[PDB]
Amino acid sequence: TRSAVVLGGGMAGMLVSSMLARHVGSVTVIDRDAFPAGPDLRKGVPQARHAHILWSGGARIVEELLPGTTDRLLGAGAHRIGIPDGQVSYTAYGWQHRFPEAQFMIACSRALLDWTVREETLREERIALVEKTEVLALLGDAGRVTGVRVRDQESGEEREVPADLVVDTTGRGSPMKRLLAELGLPAPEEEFVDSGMVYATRLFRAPEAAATNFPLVSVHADHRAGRPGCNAVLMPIEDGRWIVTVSGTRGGEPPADDEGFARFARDGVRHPLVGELIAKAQPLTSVERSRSTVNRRLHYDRLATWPEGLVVLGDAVAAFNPVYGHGMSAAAHSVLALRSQLGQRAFQPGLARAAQRAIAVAVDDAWVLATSHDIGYPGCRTQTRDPRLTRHAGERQRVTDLVGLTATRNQVVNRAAVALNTLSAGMASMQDPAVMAAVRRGPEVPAPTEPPLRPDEVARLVSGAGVTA
Ligand SMILES: Cc1cc2nc3c(=O)[nH]c(=O)nc-3n(C[C@H](O)[C@H](O)[C@H](O)COP(=O)(O)OP(=O)(O)OC[C@H]3O[C@@H](n4cnc5c(N)ncnc54)[C@H](O)[C@@H]3O)c2cc1C
Ligand SMILES: [Cl-]
């Protein structure tokens, strides 16, 4: 009984289709893009060309909704990288000591992750993916949405798709503002923090002995310094390749050419470790850039009038600067918020409004983590009403900077630090007396003077060829 229509077949659309199919009779996914039969790039997801980090918070939710996805991803060549044991990060406060595993992350190409999730989601026959179809209008009125009017691209014909619930997961380019204006409702309050961050990505062939078991390598900017923030990340992906992403805010954007790419990885960031590593490897692709790095939040939950049976989640409601890697995990938490409101209110009046408020809560942690670090950079453009970002930004920063500094050299503080940053625990977990006691206990290890690389890791950066003696 009952039917749902999900707009957009990306990450959030697939995950919320898996969830909705367990609560309604049929789910119809509407997308304007063409979908490949294998782990391929497509025009509807241009961000798949760049490095994608799936934190434990998102991966655990994906595993719950689609059991077997993690093992399937690992079987295809993905890497399970422990945190912080398997990471080499020059943090804003110094090198992070590689304590034993507290959290984890999944490392694969975004194309492989999207194809794997879609294959598992579409095993349920009651979910239908309708490709290359435009979204014309929402059916119903400003009091209740009753479906969507769509148009096939090949024919141009228009049809009505009825639904008891319409979920918008069309991503950053969501047309929900227009779709709502044609419904008569005003525009939602728009919050954004624009640092001008620009991505630049190249693919590399890892040295043979390092195709397996290699750590995530990241060189971070110092968000407290008054210089443009530049980052460099090296992430192993399937099939023995390395995806290398460099980034910079306004006034320090990475170049588009191959020559300048390696120079940026060596001298554009605070430590040349990534630049040193890529020169052990064969480049495979040219530089591809992205400018989709604005933290943007649409407050649909606070509109005076909100229609029944209409829900927005994913990048359509809250997008973030990707250098913090919370986008996919935030959408996963949003899907669970909707699932929580379905278990509580079923399809009674008030579900859509209650779902929109829980979705706003579910993304607030990722929003704060991204925007609190982005506002400091030179040339930043901010439009906000949040006192955390405005009035109380100085006091909140003096505490996180103290937490972050201690987290590089204290295991229990690091435990809470990575639990929050992987979106596996809430903000309140940082106020537990057992964490603030460890912050007051100070460091338990010396600040590393070198990249905390393991000797067996660096040994696998060379073939060992040409030696017979
Ligand atoms: C460069 C970059 C790097 C990132 N790195 C990370 C990372 O490491 N970790 C992380 O967690 N997140 C990362 N993100 C964020 C993550 O990619 C997004 O948050 C995530 O894709 C959100 O899922 P979504 O389904 O809402 O959007 P998408 O995955 O983009 O899905 C959009 C879908 O809707 C369709 N669509 C779009 N417009 C319309 C329309 N008008 N009508 C119909 N269909 C439409 C598209 O064809 C597509 O299928 C990164 C983003 C970028 C740009
Ligand atoms: Cl992009």
Author numbering: 20 to 488
Share the article's original sentences:
Lasalocid A, a polyether ionophore natural product derived from Streptomyces lasalocidi, is a widely used veterinary medicine that acts by transporting various cations across the cell membrane, thereby disrupting cation homeostasis. Lasalocid A biosynthesis entails two stereospecific epoxidation of the precursor diene, catalyzed by the flavin-dependent enzyme Lsd18. We performed protein engineering on Lsd18 to improve its thermostability and catalytic activity. Screening of these mutants using thermal shift assay identified stabilized variants Lsd18-T189M, Lsd18-S195M, and the double mutant Lsd18-T189M-S195M.
We found that the Tm values of Lsd18-T189M, Lsd18-S195M, and Lsd18-T189M-S195M were increased by 3.0 °C, 4.5 °C, and 4.8 °C, respectively. After incubating these proteins with trypsin for 45 min, the wild-type Lsd18 completely disappeared, while some intact proteins remained for the three mutants, especially for Lsd18-S195M and Lsd18-T189M-S195M. The stability of the system is obviously improved by the S195M mutation, and the captured structure is almost stable in one conformation. In order to reveal the structural basis for the higher thermostability of the best two mutants, we solved the crystal structures of Lsd18-S195M and Lsd18-T189M-S195M at the resolution of 2.50 Å and 3.76 Å, respectively. Comparing the structures of Lsd18 WT, Lsd18-S195M, and Lsd18-T189M-S195M, it can be seen that the angle of the α helix between L408 and T419 shifts, which is in agreement with the MD study. However, in the crystal structure of Lsd18-S195M, a loop in this region turns to a helix, indicating the effect of stabilization. Furthermore, the loop region R314-L316, E208-F210 and C398-Q401 in Lsd18 WT change to a β sheet in the two mutants’ crystal structures, also indicating that this region is less flexible and more stable. In wild-type Lsd18, there is a hydrogen bonding network between S195 and D187, S193 and L199. Moreover, weak hydrogen bonds formed between S195 and L198, as well as Y319. After mutating from S195 to M195, the hydrogen bonds involving D187 and Y319 were removed and new hydrophobic interactions formed between M195 and L199, as well as V331.
